[PDB]
Ligand binder design. Sequence first.
Ligand code: HEC
Ligand code: HEM
Ligand code: HEM
Ligand code: HEM
Ligand code: FES
Lengths: 101, 48, 75, 378, 108, 57, 238, 65, 98, 140
Amino acid sequence: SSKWLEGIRKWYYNAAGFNKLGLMRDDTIHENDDVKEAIRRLPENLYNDRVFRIKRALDLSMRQQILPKEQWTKYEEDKFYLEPYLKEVIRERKEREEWTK
Amino acid sequence: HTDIKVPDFSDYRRPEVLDSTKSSKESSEARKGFSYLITATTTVGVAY
Amino acid sequence: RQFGHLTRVRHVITYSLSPFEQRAFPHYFSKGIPNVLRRTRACILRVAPPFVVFYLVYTWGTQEFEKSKRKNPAA
Amino acid sequence: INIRKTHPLMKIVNNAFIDLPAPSNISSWWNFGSLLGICLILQILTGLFLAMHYTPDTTTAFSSVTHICRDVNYGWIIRYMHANGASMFFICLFMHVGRGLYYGSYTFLETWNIGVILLFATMATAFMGYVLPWGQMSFWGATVITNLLSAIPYIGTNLVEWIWGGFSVDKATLTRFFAFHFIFPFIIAALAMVHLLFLHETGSNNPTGIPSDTDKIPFHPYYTIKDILGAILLILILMLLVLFTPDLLGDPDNYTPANPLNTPPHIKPEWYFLFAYAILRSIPNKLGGVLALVLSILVLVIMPLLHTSKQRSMMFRPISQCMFWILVADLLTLTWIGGQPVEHPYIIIGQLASIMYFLIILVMMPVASIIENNLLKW
Amino acid sequence: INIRKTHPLMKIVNNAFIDLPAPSNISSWWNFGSLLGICLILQILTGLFLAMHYTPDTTTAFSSVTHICRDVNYGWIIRYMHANGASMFFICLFMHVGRGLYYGSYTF
Amino acid sequence: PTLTARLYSLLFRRTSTFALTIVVGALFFERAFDQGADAIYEHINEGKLWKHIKHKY
Amino acid sequence: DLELHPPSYPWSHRGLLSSLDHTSIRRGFQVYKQVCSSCHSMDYVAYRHLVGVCYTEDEAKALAEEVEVQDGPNEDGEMFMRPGKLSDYFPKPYPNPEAARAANNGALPPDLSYIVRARHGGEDYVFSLLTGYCEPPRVSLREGLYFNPYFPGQAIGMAPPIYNEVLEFDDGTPATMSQVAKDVCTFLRWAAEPEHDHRKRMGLKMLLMMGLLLPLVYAMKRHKWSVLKSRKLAYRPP
Amino acid sequence: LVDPLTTVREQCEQLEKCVKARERLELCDERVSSRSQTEEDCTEELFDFLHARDHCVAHKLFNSL
Amino acid sequence: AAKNVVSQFVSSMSASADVLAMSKIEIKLSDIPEGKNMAFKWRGKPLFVRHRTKKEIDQEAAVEVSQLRDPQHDLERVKKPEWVILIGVCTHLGCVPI
Amino acid sequence: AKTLLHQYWDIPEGTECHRKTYAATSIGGASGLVVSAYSVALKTPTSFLEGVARTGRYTFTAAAIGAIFGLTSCISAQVREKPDDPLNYLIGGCAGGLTLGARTRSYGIGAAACAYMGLTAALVKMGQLEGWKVFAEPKV
Ligand code: HEC
Ligand code: HEM
Ligand code: HEM
Ligand code: HEM
Ligand code: FES
């Protein structure tokens, strides 16, 4: 059940890879206009932290240099901060479609 | 902005510049000559 | 998309050194070979196990081809 | 200020090959664009010299190519370079397609359509030039694949006897094939520049899939020297296959004059059609077979609508990555199977290979992207 | 808004063929540019059909041209279009140059 | 290092002198590479050529 | 049928920088001259291509002024022969494939241009088929077929020519069986590839130029890319 | 004017699994001999030991030339 | 005008006059060994004249009707029972069978 | 059991491949069942789902050893073409030991397992080849 689902999720989060490049959930999202709108609706300091994480990750994949043990981003200390933003983007796009049709 | 220090590159350099007291003059032209002699030898191969 | 209207970035400092003063190949036998060993160990569990399946298929195909070629009655 | 920023052609060269922003963590899998460009222009120049020694006649063609190999200084190196350059051309082409499907670069719809158009065009050019030297394999493969084109009813049958110039292969068919093998690569180069134009509109794609808008570096002199090095490794492998092993990719059934009566039991084309031809004859249906082949490359067209992850790479979808490598092994299986005769286990695993091919593409990849979309609290 | 102003190809077609500001002055002497272009692609087409029916062997080149003009269907109209379309091609070339000189457009 | 420094100070300060120098080096190394390639290829066979046996006929 | 694979033999040109034995090519041309030039054709080799491989200028002029060619027109125009200096091909022993096929019990011999390169197996195949004749274990051999296993179907319409009338190597080589077979197979290797020595010479020059040039280009690429390998980022907010 | 082929083909395979398959060939030969118009022509054994004996010909011939 | 130009160009790409000029042939039958096919070129294609044995007349009698996926009787296909004469090309993809 | 080890030693070694790998995975399933049975019998896993996880871990490791060992056995025997040497199984035992160490995610366990599993697999083939009697005479 749920006590084993967390084990599967932590195995997948170890084997995903972006925990080793110092990244998080909201660092790998593929974009349309909607996700870039969600990026646009962010606070300033969170957006600064996101662009610095992105630029470090691109540098360390430029010389192909995985971070040491000290800064592998642990599972369940990461923020799912884009969940309200992206969720309201979902609701607004579905509101547009289902109201105009 | 006063505490902006450069993280060191002592692991990366050449030993001719790696010293912290030497004048960087004689270590300069030999270094440039080494890299430009590399480029010239490549140009010899490409021209052939 | 030309160069200069890309994004808005604060809070970043980039340091870099001249290409002349740092050497050509910094520790190319003391970092690169453990680095490519880590690269290889991070990929062959996701790349290698299909190709041994193909090698088994190749051996099986040639073997069964020759066995269906050879007949052996007795009279 | 500078003529490099004011002159109208130099606007194009400056905003194309100098002042282009680039993703900065490029691996050794983006040199293949420049390698395909250099393979293309080297094919054009070597074909141009070959056309400066060729006589398209159904009796003197093979003798004339022999005349090129013997009585011309270095004409053997130019003939061998055109053939092995076609080989390296398709090698670098499948590398380019494999990258452009792997790293999620197929989220660029317009470039993808223009690319698949180029894929058809390069296959057509290579097929017609493969017909041209009037060898035995050329003659019989021409007969087989043109009747495969004659599979389509009521519009295609007399269309194929029409492109034959009769009911056979003749001088008209030879000169049609020489005209099209000449004039297709220039349309290919124009579409290559259109491909390039749309990509320069959208920007490239880093191997992480993150939009790299804070990490752009200029094209010169970084990717210039990296592509020159990649081109020099390419020239090394091309001179390897034209100075040490011509026989590693040649065909023994090509070096005889097309005596139209023998039909040697060796019938396979060269490798870059062998995976396609294996999908053909693992189905006992002629029109169904050619429709299945065209629909396989149309599956390569209708890739992007299948994409239903939320991250665009395949560095970060490991089970999807494994299924991709199974797809690669299955393509190589198709290649080797098409490179064989036909008996019982060959037919069995050929049917296996085609149906598992469509099963991995059309089914396994969106199901994998959905399950590891669902397993990230998304 | 529109495809024509947001698509990278129709930007070029819009800036070459549609939103090109033309001077409202030019007479029929300026028609020879588009006529040279159409003659050029027509020469490409007729020559390409000639190339589908031609054998460049010098002993059989004359006979090959003969078989084009006789037994290939409409080979005579394709060959005659190619030759005299080259002739009208140079006529429109000379009117193009004479335009570009006499009307002083050679300041460029 | 001094031999690199003096070679830089003589030939690699200019650019036309650089191009003329690599032209001279290219022709020189062209001829020397021809000599060395002839010698090494004739050394790797030594008994199978056409030249020395055709003037030993 | 039962498929047979010829084993690889240590030929002189098997090595990756190896030449041919030009002396063996001279006597192999002599072997082709004596006995094999009755049925097989090798029309794409002129006598002038022998000048730097197996003969001199003058000896080739004698060899090519042996045979008449039947030159074309003259004052009468129809029929007259010609000695010919060098620009004659090998003069086509069977003038038509119909006349070739009726000369034997069918099964005309193919031409010998590309036999070594175009038979799914190199000179090992040709040597094995030429030397390996043996007796049938209960097959048919319908009146014109001989048994020699290195051949698809094992049925050959060629009389075994290898030791019948050994042909007196004029350089002074004792005509055994395998030595004359090795000679004519090396000569057919040469006739298939008239560029092999020169292509391995250019392979030598290319390998040395790529031992030279490639570390230079790689070094310069690493030099200009050494800035981005060692650039280092740091994060200043307030 | 005596060939070396005879010498090496006699000397190489002298007592060997080649000769084992030669006796196997004699066994299928007398199997054919005790049968009217057989299918199994006893040729399969001929090919595979001559394949083996010509491998050992391939290893040890070219010194004699 | 456009459909006339398209029509005349496709008919220009059709064939030659003498390529459409086929011919009638006469073949001699009994030059052929037993159980064996001989091919004579005609209308571009090979032309099969095969001596089928009386054993092969019996093997044609040993052919099931509907198990032929193109189910046809032998007398529906041949005229004389012991000599067979057909088009020398397999009609699937232009191969010539052995 | 006797049946599956007899299946494993039935096939010539030799090239009759991947039956060897499946028989070695059956060896792995049996070994994992033994170890998992004693381990859940002598732990009180608390609770049963974690016991299922432990059993799955042991059976997966033993089956992976069997699979990798059978693959490298067959491949090495096909490449070296000498079906009588024990050195191919020496390489096989070292490969199985390294993969055991990697699934246990260590270095020293992998290297010592390489050494001991290689030498014992060499002893297995060496005794099966020269002929050492299985578990008894029992005669005198
Ligand atoms: C006329 C008789 C000769 C002579 C003097 C030689 N050959 Fe042979 N040969 C001849 C025929 C009619 C055929 C065809 C038979 C068949 O189709 O089975 C052949 C065949 C060959 C081959 C064929 C192998 C293949 O087709 O793959 C070869 C390589 C060959 N002949 C070589 C050869 C050599 C080297 C000869 C000189 C010693 C030679 N033949 C003599 C007819 C004749
Ligand atoms: C005619 C042969 C082709 C040529 C000459 C060609 C040329 C190029 C070039 C020069 C680039 C830019 C360099 C690079 O990104 O590595 C490129 C990128 C690309 N091409 Fe092609 N291409 C060809 C075929 C294709 C095909 C068949 C496709 C698939 C539809 C394709 C899809 C792409 C994509 C998606 C990119 C962007 C890759 C990225 O930015 O990561 N190309 N091509
Ligand atoms: C427009 C430029 C080209 C010209 C003029 C040209 C001309 C020729 C000619 C005359 C031949 C016959 C020579 C021979 O094969 O011995 C030939 C063969 C061939 N061409 Fe091209 N070609 C061109 C471009 C290409 C391209 C772009 C490709 C694809 C990469 C290609 C693929 C081939 C192949 C595969 C052969 C057969 C090679 C062989 O078997 O030797 N050609 N071409
Ligand atoms: C690229 C497309 C073209 C091809 C493939 C092509 C091909 C040919 C061929 C095969 C011929 C010989 C047939 C003949 O002489 O009647 C020919 C003749 C000729 N072509 Fe072209 N051509 C092309 C474009 C042009 C162009 C643009 C011109 C210049 C306007 C031109 C001028 C001529 C002329 C003057 C002749 C001589 C006609 C004659 O003497 O019979 N061609 N062309
Ligand atoms: S069956 Fe496909 S062509 Fe004869």
